[PDB]
């Protein structure tokens, strides 16, 4: 059918003519702006309310879904046509397949931006969504249905500027925790992504998540074999340990450190980098937390990463080392030196990156302060020289950056 044929059929008072026409509009979309120009979107939306005719409900939801998956102008056309409250009403439809259409549709809309997300929320989509997931047995739900429900929830958690409303996140979180105990890889992935979004903010957002008791299950998922599961699990854990010392402690007490020998040696670059990033924030913690890194035998792994990884992962390793030397005890620093930290640290002093130079110089300064309390400054000096460190530190006196030439000047005058 062409546009005009459909318009006539949809605008008739014959229900089956309306159904036939909507079926035709479905297959065409399966000329969007000509459909919109004819004003067919409000017709589709009104057809969603024909409870006595589930076939035309299905056909309309489908049509509205296609148009919504297009450009922003078309998505807002679908939205300003009123698809959001209409779809929300269909979440509790006695027709399961219709309810599923509404879930998927609300998912795409909410995943466009914070504005549409909050619109979906403010029309009250969360309660009926959570009601659908409140069943005693999740296996009673279609696997596609369950996946769509999970994906929709994560979109309601996604995006900042602004972050989702606190009450919304509060209502959603316990359901996300339960979904973390599911066995479907895709359900687990999206649930972990949802958690990663919520922990990507101020400590208050982290505290909400951590207080729900989600950390032990995250740590378990960290050890999964499926990369699409490990990646957001690691991100979520990583976000959490950016917080307070006690929030970081709960990650440690969950046994997360035991997974990191495999994470730090994972062949996938991204996993290595974010695991090292995660370690850097743990060594930014207290002395007792640093000691836990030691006891798990992770220091040689960090030394390994600093030596044999891609440069940006090396930078994260340099952060882990400097954070280690800033909060660590003299004893912890001695052990660090025995793991052979000096040479790979010196090798990176020639990097063209100003930030890593500042970071490494800070580590060197901290290690010297430890050597001083040992009365071993000369030996540390001789050690740094014998691995090419002195030549690099001196060259850094003619560096353009103020923090760099000040620090390197200080080190030279002070120990060399």
């Amino acid at each position: 059918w062409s546009v005009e044929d459909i318009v006539k059929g949809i605008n008739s008072n014959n229900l089956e003519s309306q159904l036939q026409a909507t079926q035709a509009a479905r297959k065409l979309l399966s000329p969007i702006d000509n459909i919109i120009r004819a004003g067919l979107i409000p017709k589709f939306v009104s057809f969603l309310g024909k409870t006595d005719c589930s076939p035309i409900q299905f056909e309309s939801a489908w049509a509205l879904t296609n148009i919504a998956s297009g450009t922003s102008e078309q998505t807002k056309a679908v939205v300003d046509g009123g698809a959001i409250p209409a779809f929300i009403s269909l979440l509790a439809s006695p027709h399961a397949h219709i309810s599923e259409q509404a879930v998927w549709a609300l998912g795409n809309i909410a995943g466009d931006g914070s504005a549409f997300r909050d619109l979906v929320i403010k029309h009250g989509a969360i309660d009926p969504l959570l009601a659908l997931l409140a069943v005693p047995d999740l296996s009673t739900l279609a696997c596609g249905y369950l996946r769509n429900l999970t994906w929709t929830l994560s979109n309601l958690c996604r995006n900042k500027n602004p972050a989702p409303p606190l009450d919304a996140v509060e209502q959603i979180l316990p359901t996300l925790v339960r979904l973390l105990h599911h066995n479907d890889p895709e359900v687990l992935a999206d649930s972990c992504w949802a958690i990663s979004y919520l922990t990507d903010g101020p400590n208050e957002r982290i505290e909400m998540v951590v207080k729900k008791g989600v950390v032990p299950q995250l740590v378990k998922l960290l050890g999964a074999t499926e990369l699409p599961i490990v990646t957001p699990a690691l991100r979520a854990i990583g976000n959490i340990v950016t917080g307070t010392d006690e929030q970081t402690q709960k990650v440690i007490d969950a046994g997360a450190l035991a997974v990191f020998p495999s994470l730090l040696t994972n062949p996938k670059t991204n996993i290595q980098k974010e695991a090292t990033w995660t370690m850097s924030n743990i060594t930014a913690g207290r002395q007792d937390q640093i000691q836990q890194v030691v006891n798990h035998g992770l220091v040689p792994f960090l030394v390994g990463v600093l030596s044999k990884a891609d440069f940006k992962t090396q930078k994260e390793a340099a952060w882990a080392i400097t954070n280690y030397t800033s909060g660590g005890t003299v004893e912890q620093i001695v052990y660090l030196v025995h793991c052979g930290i000096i040479e790979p640290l010196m090798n990176l002093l020639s990097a063209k990156d100003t930030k890593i130079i500042q970071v490494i110089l800070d580590a060197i300064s901290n290690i010297f302060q430890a050597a001083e309390k040992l009365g071993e400054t000369e030996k540390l000096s001789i050690m740094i020289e014998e691995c090419g460190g002195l030549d690099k530190i001196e060259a850094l006196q003619r560096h353009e950056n103020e923090s760099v030439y000040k620090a390197s000047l200080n080190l030279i005058e002070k120990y060399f």
Partner: peptide, 12 residues
């Protein structure tokens, strides 16, 4: 003293 916490956006 103590080390520096860096958020995900602070890393990248």
């Amino acid at each position: 003293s103590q080390g520096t916490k860096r958020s995900y956006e602070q890393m990248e």
